[PDB]
Design a protein around this nucleic acid. Structure first.
Ligand SMILES: [Zn+2]
Length: 344
DNA sequence: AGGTTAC
């Protein structure tokens, strides 16, 4: 549902027609008034101008999936006579809906300038650690939105965070990645992924193109991982190989979706390293085979991987990886158990 | 004089 919205340039939500940020970053000679809806990648507090009409101004940089991960976004200057009605943004990551913004050149970069009537709507950084990233906004310019643009805003937020959050809490890593064959009460799947580009006949090792994520209650971590893939701006000619590192092997249902991903993407290879083998003693074993037979490459995490995930996806803050007793022992029986699965 | 001010 979200992939195709951002392609044509214009997409509608509620009753308002939005223009993507990438498409907005181009220009015509004349000024054209668009609706925007994105993430605050950076902003500057509302200070009063020192020149010209001296109106109050706040600065935002909106981003959306049509811009790459590393892209800062569209420069937008929001102006107002009173100024005490401009959006009060508290931190980077807030979803932002802007209504009636003019698009023009300034010394060859595209900026947005606010119309007089410009209105807005803000949302908290949902995937932040705080609740109160969103404080009570000034009433004059504020817009009453519903649940429909709730989905959209949260979606953009979720994709943003799942591109600007590599680091994880160290006690979390210990507990979830404990590779003892049967454990309680992990319940959730933690998934740490790498991306590798094809250049010079060998994988270009991508440190900044990494990420990790954890599931919701009751979708799955495997599905949430697949959602950020289309929003990677992947070169269609270049072949890519994903290696994700999971805490639990994917269930039967997510193994099917990860298999149907290999069928949909002809330039993407999928390689899975898991810490435990999830066996529901139902169709989970078949799911490993089905994903396997679809082209995907699965194996058990060994000491090499456990060190690497601690060197990459954890906020060790200087502590080297401290292994638990029986890590190699459990990874051996599991390597036997995995080998037995692909045989049946 | 809609795009100066912000830059
Ligand atoms: Zn699953």
């Amino acid at each position: 549902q979200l992939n195709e919205l951002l392609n044509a340039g214009e997409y509608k939500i509620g009753e308002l027609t939005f223009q993507s940020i990438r498409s907005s970053q181009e220009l015509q000679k004349k000024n054209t008034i668009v609706n925007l809806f994105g993430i605050v990648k950076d902003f500057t507090p509302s200070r009063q101008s020192l020149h010209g009409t001296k109106d109050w101004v706040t600065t935002v940089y909106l981003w959306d999936p049509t811009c790459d991960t590393s892209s800062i976004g569209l420069q937008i200057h929001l102006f107002s006579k009173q100024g005490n009605d401009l959006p009060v943004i508290k931190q980077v990551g807030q979803p932002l809906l802007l209504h009636q913004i003019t698009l023009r050149s300034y010394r060859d970069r595209t900026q947005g300038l606010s119309k007089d009537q410009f209105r807005y709507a803000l949302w908290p950084d949902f995937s932040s650690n705080s609740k109160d990233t969103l404080c009570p906004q000034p009433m004059p310019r504020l817009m009453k939105t519903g649940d429909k643009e709730e989905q959209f805003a949260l979606l953009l937020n979720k994709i943003w965070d799942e591109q600007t959050n590599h680091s994880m809490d160290p006690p979390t890593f210990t507990f979830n990645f404990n590779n003892e064959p049967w454990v309680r009460g992990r319940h959730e799947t933690y998934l740490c992924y790498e991306v590798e580009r094809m250049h010079n006949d060998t994988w270009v090792k991508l440190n900044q193109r990494r990420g990790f994520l954890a599931n919701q209650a009751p979708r799955h971590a495997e599905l949430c991982f697949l959602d950020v893939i289309p929003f990677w701006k992947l070169d269609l000619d270049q072949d890519y190989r994903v290696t994700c590192f999971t805490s639990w092997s994917p269930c039967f249902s997510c193994a099917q979706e990860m298999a149907k991903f290999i069928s949909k993407n002809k330039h993407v290879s999928l390689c899975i390293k898991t810490a435990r083998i999830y066996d529901d003693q139902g169709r989970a074993q078949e799911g490993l085979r089905t994903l396997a037979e679809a082209g995907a490459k699965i194996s058990i995490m060994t000491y090499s991987e456990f060190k690497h995930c601690w060197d990459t996806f954890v906020d060790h803050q200087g502590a080297p990886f401290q292994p638990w007793d029986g890590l190699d022992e459990h990874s051996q029986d599991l390597s036997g158990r995995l080998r037995a699965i692909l045989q049946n």
